[PDB]
C-alpha cells in the first residue's frame, strides 16, 4: 500500500551529474507508483545518518524500501545492518550499470540482505522496483 | 518490436527444480508482451552452441536479447563474446538473488557487456525486463 | 537396484589417453554390478548438453548417480546445478589422483553438492562407488 | 597381507562426536579385512609424536596405511613429511565430506602424496580403502 | 573515576534489532557502574561525526571510553583515527560474536589501537569492559 | 557450578616470558572463583594431546571451559574440532592484544565456535571470563 | 581567482592530535593565496555530508578544491563520486606521509579521479598546492 | 604433410563480428598451405564436444594441430586435457592480441601444453604457424 | 625496408645456455630477411640502459622492432615506457614456450603495449616475426 | 644550499615522449631554483648504475635530492636501498598523475622511505619540490 | 661456550629418508664442537611439547639453539613464541633447500626471531652455524 | 680450487651504510680463503649487466659462485637466469637477516636455483660459504 523510496549521497545531482533531475525522478515515481493503486514516499539525503533513520522507519512500519544508496552501497555495512531488519521486501537500484565500471563497484553489502536488484535500466529501474511490490500483495 | 528471450541450462526444469513451469514462463512472457505491443520469442537450450546460434540470430537481426544463461553465466568467455556483438540492448535476468548464494554466484561475465541486470525479482523480472525495452523505442 | 554412471568428455579414450578402455570398464562395472545385485546404467558424453541430460532423467527418476565429469569437474557450474536436484547418492570419481597434479585440478564445484568423493584408486573407484551403494539401500 | 589403520585425533569420539564408535570402527575394519585375506592393525592417537612413530614403523615395514589423520590433515607437514617416506600404498580417509563444510577444509597435506583419497562415504570409506589394498598385490 | 561509553549506528534498536533495550542498557551499566565507584557517561549516536566528537571529548578529558561502534568497526579508518589520540584506555566491545559472522565482520580498524577486545559476551561485556577499568586505577 | 581453566603452551612461562607467573594466575583464578560460588580447575600444558583430553572430558562432562590455547589458537583445526564438541560455553582467553602484533594472529580457529572473546585485558581477562559463566547460570 | 580548501575528519585537531593548529592552517593558506592574487576559502568538517556539499558547491561554481579528506580518503566512494563531477581541478594533499604508514593508508580513492597530489610535505603542501592553481590560470 | 587448422566458437562470424570472413580465412590457410607443400584441413565448430572430436582425430592421426579455440581457451580444461593427448606439434592461435584486453584472457589453459603461441598478428598467424610446421619435418 | 631486431641479456648465450648461437642467429635473421626485401639490424645488449637507447632510436626513426628482452619482459616497466613510444609495429618474441616454465614467467609487460607475440617456436620466430612486418606495409 | 634533481629512465625524451623538453626542464628548475637562493644541480641517466652513484654522492655529501626515478620507481628495491641511505631530505616526483593509469603504477618502493611525494602536477612538481627544500632550512 | 642442537621431527630418519644418519650427525657435530672448544648438546624429538621443553631451557640457561624444526618450521606458532625468548642467538637450519621445493616451504616462523638461517648445505649447515657462534663470543 | 665472490648494488657502501668495509671484506675472504687452499676473486659492482658478465665468465669456466646480489635478489630474473647457467655450486649470501625486515625480502629468485643459502651472519656468511665449498671437493 505505501513504498519507501530512499536515495543516497549524490543522488540530488541528477543531471548536473541529457539529465532527468531528481525533482523530476520523484515526479515520476509518484505518478506511476499512482497508476499501480501505490504510494511513494521518496526521500533522498547525503547523509548516512539520515538514511539509516528512514530505514529504521520502514522496518518499525514493515513497509518495502526500494533502496539506491549510491556509494554507501559499496563501503557501507552500518547502512546494511539497518536494511537487515526490514521484514517488508527491499529492491536495490542502479541508475548506471555498476559491473561495466570499476571493479570496486561490483560489491554490494546490500545485495545479499536485498530481496533482489535492478541495475543499468536508468531511471526506470525505480518504475519497476515499484511494480514488483505492486504485484507481490 | 520483437523481443528474444534466451533461457540456458537447467531452466528447462523450474518446478520440479511452489513451482511455476518453463511452459507456464512462456506463456506469462507471451501474454506481458502481446499488452506491451511487442513479440516475444521465447527459447531454452542446454547447449551452449544453441544459445551461440540464437545469440548470432540476434546480433544479425539487431533485436534485443534478454538472457537468463544459468550456470554459463558464471563460468563462459564464449557466450559473452557472442552477447558483445548484439547492437540491439541486452538485458541479464536472474530468477534467484545470485548474491544471497555462493560467493562464486557473484561474477558475472555477462554483465559488463549487457545494458543491465535483473536478480532475484524471480519470474517476474522476465516481464520488467520486456517493459524496459518497450519504453525505450 | 539401478545406478547410473556418467562419465564425461575424454573418458572414452582410456588406453589411448599400459590402458583399460572404456568398452572393458564398462564390462567390469556390469560384473561387479551383477554380484552387488544391482543394475549399473553406464554411458560417456563429450557434450554437456547430453551429460545434464542424463542427470536430468536420474534426477527425475531418484536412482543414485556415480559421476567422473573429467574437465568439466573444475568449470561447470551448470553441471553442478543439475548434480544438486538429485535426491538419490551422488559419487564423484576420478581415476587419476587430482589433488598431485596441477593445482587448478584441487578445486571440484562437484564435490560440495555430492555424497562424497574417490580419487586416484583408477578404475576401481568406480566399483567401489557401487558398493558404496548397495551397502546404502 | 597386513594392512595399518591409522586415525589421528578427535576420532575416539565418534558416537558422543546416531553414532557407531571407535570400537565398533576396529571391530568392523578388522571382520570385512578377514574376509578379504588381510590382516588390519588399526591404532588411534591424539599424539602428532605417535601417529609419526606409527607412520616409520609402516615405512620401514613397507605395509600400506590407511590413514584419517583428522584436523591434522589440514595443518600437518610433518606428518606428511613421514607419509611421504612410505613404499606401500597410502590411502587418505574422511568421514565426512570435507568439501561441503568449511573451506579451509578442502585443503589437505596428505591428499598430493597418497595413493588417493576417499570422502564422505563414511564409516564404510576405511572398509572400501581395504578392498582396493587386496585387489593391488 | 568517569567512563566514557560510546554506541555506534543501529544500537539504539536492541530488542527490536528477547530483546534487552538500549535504556535498559544505560539503566544496567550505570547500576553496575556506581557499584564499581564509577561514573558511567553513555551515549549512542548513527551519526559519525557525532561519534567523532565525543571521542574528541574524551581524548582531551583523558577518559577512558568503552566503545561498541557498530558497522563503522569494520569500515572508519575516521574513527579509528579519533580512537588513536586516546591517552586512556579504549575497549572494544562487541555484543554478538563477530567471529561466527560474516568473514567480512572478522577485521576490525579499532582493535589494532585499543587496549582490548571484548566480543560475544553479550550486553555483559560492557560490565565486564567497566570492571577492568576500575581495577586498573 | 564448575569451570575448566585451561592453558596452551608457553604458558608457563608467564612472568619469565613485571611479571605475574601462572603459579600466581592459578591463585588469582581460584581466588575470585570462590567468591563467585563457583570452583575453577585450572591446568596448563604445552601438549596439544594433553589439552584435548582435557577438553574431551569437559565435553563429556558438560562443563564450561576457559581456554588461552597459545600459539595453537592460529594454527590448529585439531583443537578446535574438539572445542566444537562442548555443550556449555567456552570462551577464548588472550592476554595480549593479538590484534596490534602480527597479522598471522589476527586470524582464530577458536573465536568461530567459541561463545565469545577476550583480548588484551591481561591476567584479568580470565577473572571477567568467571564473571560472565556466574552470571548465566 | 578563488580556491576552496577543504579538510575532512580530525583535521580540526592538528596540535592536540610540536603542533600547528588549523586556526593557523588557516591563517597561513589565507596569508600566502593573499600573495599569489588568489582568495582561499578554507573549511573543515568531521561530517562526509557537509564535505559532500561543499564540494556541490564548487562542483556547480568550477572552482578549484584542495581537499585533504583524512580518513574518508581511504574508504569513501561518496566523497570520490562528489569530486568526479568537479572541472575545475582537484588536488588532494596529505600532511603525514601516508605510504610510510600502514598498508591500507596506501590506497586513495580520491587520487585517480584527482588532478594530483601532495603527500608527507606537512603543512606547506596546501601552499603549494595553491602555488600550482595560481600558476595553471 | 596435413595439418588441422581448428577454430573454436564465434570464429564463424569474422567480418560480421574491415573484415576477412572465415571463408577467406579458409581461403587463405588453403593457398599459402599448398605453396608450402602441406595440405590444410580447416574446421570451425562452436561446439565444445566437436572440437575434441577432431582434436581426439587429430591425436589418433598425429597429425599437427593450429587450435583457435576461442573463448573456451581461458575456460576450457576439458579442451586442454584433448589437446594434451596429440604427439604432433600444437600450435595455439590468437587473433586479436588477448594481452591488451581484459585481464582474465591473460591466462590460457591451452598454452602451457601447446608447442608455441602466436598472437595479436591477426589472421596472418595461422599462415605463420603453418610455415612453422613445414620447417619442421 | 629496415627492422630492428633487439635482444635483451643472456641471448648472447645461445647454444652454451643442441644449441645454435647469437652469431648465427644474426647469420639466419639477415638471410631471411634478405629475401623478403628487408634489412635486418640486428642488436643484443646485456645493458638495460642499451636496450633503451636502441628503442629510443627505433621510436624517433619509426622503424619496426622486433623484441626478445629476455628476464626483462617480466620485470622491466622501464623498458615497456621505451617501448610505448614506438610507432612503428612492435613484435614481442620468446624462444621457449615461456607458459609451460615457472607461474612468474607468464606475466610480461611489454605483450599489452606490444602489436603481438610469439613463444616458443623457437629460433624461427624471429623469422616469422620478419615475415608479419614484410607482408605489412 | 645544494639540491640535486635526478631523473631516471625515458625522462630525457619529454616533448618527443605539447612537450616541454628536458633541457627547458633543467633551465627552469635552474632559474626558479637561483629565485630561491638554492643551487639546483640536474642529472638524467638511463642506467640505475647510474643514478645509484649520484645518490652515493648526495649520501655522503648530505645534500637533499629530488628524484624521478621513472619505471624503476615501481620495480627497483636496488634504489630504494640506495635512497634509503640519505640522511637529507627526499621527495619523489612524478610529473603524470600514476594512479590515474595502470594498477602496477600505484606502488612505489621509494615512497616508503622518502620525505614525502608530489604527483601529477606536470613539470611544476620539481619547482614545488625545490620551494618545500627552501622553507626547511 | 655450550650451544644446544636442536632437531624436529622425523630428523630421526636421516638415511632411510646416500645417508648420513642422525647418530652419525651428532658424531660430527660433537667431534667438530670439540676443535672450536665448544660443547654441543645434541637432541632430537618427534613431540613439539619436548621441543619446548628444551628451549626453555636453553632460554633460561641463555644459551645459544641450533634449530632444525622440521615440518613445524612451517606450521608451528607455539614453537617460534618459544625461541622468542632466547637470549642467546638462535640459528635455523635446514638441510635440504627448502626454496627449491614445495612453496608452502617457503615460509618459515622461525626465521624472522632468528638471528639467521643456512638452508641447503646439507649436514654442514650443522657444522657451520657452530663456527658462527664460536667467532661471536 | 677457485672460488668467484660477487657482490651486487650498494655493497660498495658497507660501513658508511660499527661497519666493516667492502675492502675490508675482500681482505677478510682473501685471508680465511687462503687457510682453506682456495684462491678468492671477490668483485662488487652496482651495474646488473657487469654481474651477469662476471656470471658468465665463471659459468664457460665452471667455477662457484658466492652471490651477494643486495636489491636485484628481489627483483631480478635476468640474473636468475644467468646463475641458472652455472654448473659448480651456486652460494646465496645476505649480511643482514632479510627475513626479520620487510616483507617483499622474503622472496628470492636465486634461492630455488641456487645450491643453498646464508642470511642474517653478518660478514662472516661469506667465510662460511667459503668453508662449504673446501669441503665438497
Ligand atoms: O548510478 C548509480 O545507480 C549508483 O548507484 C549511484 C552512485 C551515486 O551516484 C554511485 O556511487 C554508484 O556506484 C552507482
Ligand atoms: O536462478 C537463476 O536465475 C540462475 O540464473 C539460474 C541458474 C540455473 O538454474 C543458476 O546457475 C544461476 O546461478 C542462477
Ligand atoms: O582422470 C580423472 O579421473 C579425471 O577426472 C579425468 C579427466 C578427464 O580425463 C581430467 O579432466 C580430470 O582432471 C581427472
Ligand atoms: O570427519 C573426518 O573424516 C575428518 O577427517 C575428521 C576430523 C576429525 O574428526 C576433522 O578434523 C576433519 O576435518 C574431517
Ligand atoms: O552486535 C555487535 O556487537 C556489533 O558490534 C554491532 C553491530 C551493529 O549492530 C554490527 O554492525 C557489528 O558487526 C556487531
Ligand atoms: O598472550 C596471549 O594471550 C596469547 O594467547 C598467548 C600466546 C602464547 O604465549 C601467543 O601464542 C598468542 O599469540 C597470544
Ligand atoms: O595526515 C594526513 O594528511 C592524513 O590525510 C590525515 C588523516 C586524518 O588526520 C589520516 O586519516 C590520513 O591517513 C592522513
Ligand atoms: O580473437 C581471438 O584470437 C580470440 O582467440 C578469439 C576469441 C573469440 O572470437 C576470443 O574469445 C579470444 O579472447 C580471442
Ligand atoms: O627463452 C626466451 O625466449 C626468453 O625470452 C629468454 C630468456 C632469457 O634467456 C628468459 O629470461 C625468458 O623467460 C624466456
Ligand atoms: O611520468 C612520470 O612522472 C613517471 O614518473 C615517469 C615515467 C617514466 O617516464 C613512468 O615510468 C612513471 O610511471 C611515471
Ligand atoms: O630437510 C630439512 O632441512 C628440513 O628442515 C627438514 C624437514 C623434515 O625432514 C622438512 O620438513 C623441511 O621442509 C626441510
Ligand atoms: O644486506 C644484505 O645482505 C642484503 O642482501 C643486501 C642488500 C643490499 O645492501 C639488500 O638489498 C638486501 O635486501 C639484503
Sequence with gaps: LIVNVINGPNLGRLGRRGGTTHDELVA?????????????????????????????????????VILNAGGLTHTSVALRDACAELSAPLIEVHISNVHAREEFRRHSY??????????????????????????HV
Design 110 to 135: 546490500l545485495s545479499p540482505i536485498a530481496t533482489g536488484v535492478i541495475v543499468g535500466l536508468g531511471i526506470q529501474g525505480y518504475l519497476l522496483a515499484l511494480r514488483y511490490l505492486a504485484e
Design 28 to 64: 515520476l515515481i509518484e505518478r506511476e507508483a499512482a497508476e499501480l493503486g501505490l504510494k511513494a514516499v521518496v526521500r533522498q539525503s547525503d547523509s548516512e545518518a539520515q538514511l539509516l533513520d528512514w530505514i529504521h522507519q520502514a522496518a518499525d512500519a514493515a513497509e518495502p
